[PDB]
From Swiss-Prot:
The chain holds residues 213 to 298 of 562 of the full protein. Disulfide bonds join C3-C84, C24-C66, C55-C79. It comes from Homo sapiens. This is Tissue-type plasminogen activator chain A. The gene is PLAT. Residues 3-84 form the Kringle domain. Glycans are attached at N7. The record marks N41 as: Not glycosylated. Transmembrane segments: none annotated.
Amino acid sequence: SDCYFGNGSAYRGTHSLTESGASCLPWNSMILIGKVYTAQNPSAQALGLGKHNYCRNPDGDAKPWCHVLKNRRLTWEYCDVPSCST
Ligand SMILES: [Cl-]
């Protein structure tokens, strides 16, 4: 939607931008091999983790995040989705 409710675990929108203004890596990236929260996750479907780079909260984190490259380094970061409450 236009916003996430609670911690956004049910969020299934198209926001693909982090707090720092960086665009998310897609969940199916080759770069995420070894990670748990990828498209190859056994529950990828249930989590909204697929061949996209949309902001998700598959792990009970605070709000929707995504994996990103922070100057060639692989990290993750919260995304820019406004809370439905803000
Ligand atoms: Cl992970």
